[PDB]
Amino acid sequence: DIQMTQSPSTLSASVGDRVTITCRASQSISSWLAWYQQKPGKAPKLLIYKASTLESGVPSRFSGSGSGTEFTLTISSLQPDDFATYYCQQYNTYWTFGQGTKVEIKRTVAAPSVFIFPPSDEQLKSGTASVVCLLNNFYPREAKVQWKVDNALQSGNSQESVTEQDSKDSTYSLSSTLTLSKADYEKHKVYACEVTHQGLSSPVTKSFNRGE
Amino acid sequence: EVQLLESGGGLVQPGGSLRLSCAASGFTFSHYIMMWVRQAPGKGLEWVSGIYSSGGITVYADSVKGRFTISRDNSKNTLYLQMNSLRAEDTAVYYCAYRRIGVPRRDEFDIWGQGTMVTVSSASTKGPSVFPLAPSGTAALGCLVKDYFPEPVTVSWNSGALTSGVHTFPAVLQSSGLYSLSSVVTVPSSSLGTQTYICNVNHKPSNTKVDKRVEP
Amino acid sequence: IVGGTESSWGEWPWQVSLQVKLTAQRHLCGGSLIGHQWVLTAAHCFDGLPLQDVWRIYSGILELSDITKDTPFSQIKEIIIHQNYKVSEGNHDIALIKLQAPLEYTEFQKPISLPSKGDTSTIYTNCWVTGWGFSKEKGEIQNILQKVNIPLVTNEECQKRYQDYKITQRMVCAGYKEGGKDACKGDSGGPLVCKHNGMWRLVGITSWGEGCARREQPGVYTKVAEYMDWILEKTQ
């Protein structure tokens, strides 16, 4: 079968930059390659087909090249409307999409403000304890959040959720929720959130003792 | 131009069935290959099924062969996806798309629908539990909107009076089949003893409108 | 027409509007009156709406917003698509329309002359494309008949810009290197005419092309001189 591999997965750019995204097919597809733009919650829009042909009404800042296994989408001068996820698609045989490339707004580094929230008493009655760590308004996206319970690293018991780039300042915010049985929560004292991020000169830890 | 409108998506039990329709309108000189493509929450576009002509070749991705059937009824300018034996992982926004056959005639190669949402789950409709994220220059607080089904909930702060510095995160699907999210906001710490902060959570599917005040 | 200007009465008196009347009435294509009873157009105009009953042909008309229930129109008695034309494709994109009733000529409504037998190898230098089609890509039907002057290019040149289709000797192409002036959607089926020895001739029928008015991307037209035996047989 035919596997498509796009790269990079995410890239950061500014209004006016030239952007380049690559797509690789596992076998030759000649020129049967199309490129697409997608905004969150909206249908994709075709930009390019037969590897280098602009679709009806698409601005000429979009261009495509390649044949065989190797294809590039180029955006000559990025506009605000262009921040989006981009997909390639072979249509040699049926259709297969690449895994997509996210094109995000570049800005200067911004450190997260970190907060820790213990489970409410109202929740501990129901038999489950949620501990929420908040990382607010940071950039870039990459952040390490590690949970420690009496200085012991936690695994498999937390999930991260993240917002889209804020429309005003281009930052991200992220939640990390530690999920535990009431029984287990009460077995320990110190609940720690350790955040590593490029905006910080060293890791920041926010914590609280069960009770206090 | 030609416009495509999907309908027929919704909530269904695993093992159940659902028929999607895609209704086309307008004038065209073109004939079209017709495709179904879907997108699971937070994932990439996945091609699913195709039909090359009115009574022509129909083809399927392996992930749905045997379960899905694509068809057309030209008298209704409609394309159909009959989905049988549905599974949790078939949960996605389903898009229809048309693709122009033959030479370009000053016109478009692709036309896409708006998408219609399909949720396959054995979970039961349930309102959220709402727990406060209690605050410790600027302070943060929030609400944990927990154990609810299906999407979505809306969250508001002080009946829409407070909107600056609000981040409501995307829901997560817990291993239990129910969703969880938090909504947070940053305020000045000087305002914590005087200003009342209430998060207004609405879950239409269960007609539940819950309000929690958040206190230090 | 992209990059064109307004036409005047009697300026292109062969130009017709081919319109469909379903729940709504819309202009779909241009055509060219080549005799009292005969219109020449593109076969592809009927690819989606093949039934002759649903069409209405307007002649001696400059403005589409003039049309009312009482505006007289011609109806189709016969559609003659070239035997080798294939739905959705570029070759042999030509169709004769016999009207239900012969039209009399007026200063606003008269036929275009077909290419003459002696001009097989003529290099036409003064060529025009007309119609009510979009004024840009994904645009809108225009109200007043638009015209634009466009130079022909060679088939070798045209072929370099259409790598995935064969440009045959039965096609001719037109456009500017840097684009800007061109037919577009809704113009298709209408004339490409050139003035030669003081006489206008129908050189092309607006057929297909990639986008509208793009640089290095000439539109493609059915080359009428190569269908003259077919036109004379079918109309005689």
Numbering used by the authors:
A (entry chain L): 1 to 212
B (entry chain H): 1 to 136, 143 to 222
C (entry chain A): 391 to 626
Publication passage describing the model:
Plasma kallikrein (pKal) proteolytically cleaves high molecular weight kininogen to generate the potent vasodilator and the pro-inflammatory peptide, bradykinin. pKal activity is tightly regulated in healthy individuals by the serpin C1-inhibitor, but individuals with hereditary angioedema (HAE) are deficient in C1-inhibitor and consequently exhibit excessive bradykinin generation that in turn causes debilitating and potentially fatal swelling attacks. To develop a potential therapeutic agent for HAE and other pKal-mediated disorders, we used phage display to discover a fully human IgG1 monoclonal antibody (DX-2930) against pKal. In vitro experiments demonstrated that DX-2930 potently inhibits active pKal (Ki = 0.120 ± 0.005 nm) but does not target either the zymogen (prekallikrein) or any other serine protease tested. Here, we describe the discovery and biochemical characterization of DX-2930, including the x-ray structure of the Fab·pKal complex, which provides a rationale for the specificity and effectiveness of DX-2930.
X-ray crystallographic analysis of the DX-2930 Fab region bound to pKal details the molecular basis of our discovery, demonstrating that the antibody binds and occludes the substrate-binding active site region of the protease. Inspection of the complex structure reveals the reason why DX-2930 prevents substrate proteolysis by pKal. Namely, the Fab interface covers ∼2400 Å2 of surface and completely obstructs the active site of pKal. The most intimate interactions between the DX-2930 Fab and pKal catalytic domain are mediated by the same heavy chain CDR3 residues that led to affinity improvements. The CDR3 loop extends deeply into the active site of pKal and interacts with both the substrate binding region and the catalytic triad. Arg-106 anchors the loop, burying into the canonical S1 binding pocket and forming a bidentate bonding interaction with pKal D572, much like the broad serine protease inhibitor benzamidine. On the opposite side of the complex interface, Lys-50 of LV-CDR2 makes a side chain-mediated interaction with pKal residues Tyr-555 and Glu-600. Finally, Glu-108, which is predominantly acidic/polar in the most inhibitory affinity maturation variants, contacts Lys-575 of pKal in an interaction that is likely to be a significant driver of DX-2930 specificity with respect to other serine proteases, most of which have a Gln or Glu at this position. Taken together, the composition and extended length of the HV CDR3 allows the intimate contact of this loop with the pKal active site, while being short enough to steer the potentially labile peptide backbone of this loop away from the proteolytic residues of pKal. Of note, the complex structure is consistent with a proposed competitive inhibition mechanism given that binding of this antibody to pKal will exclude even small peptide substrates from the pKal active site.
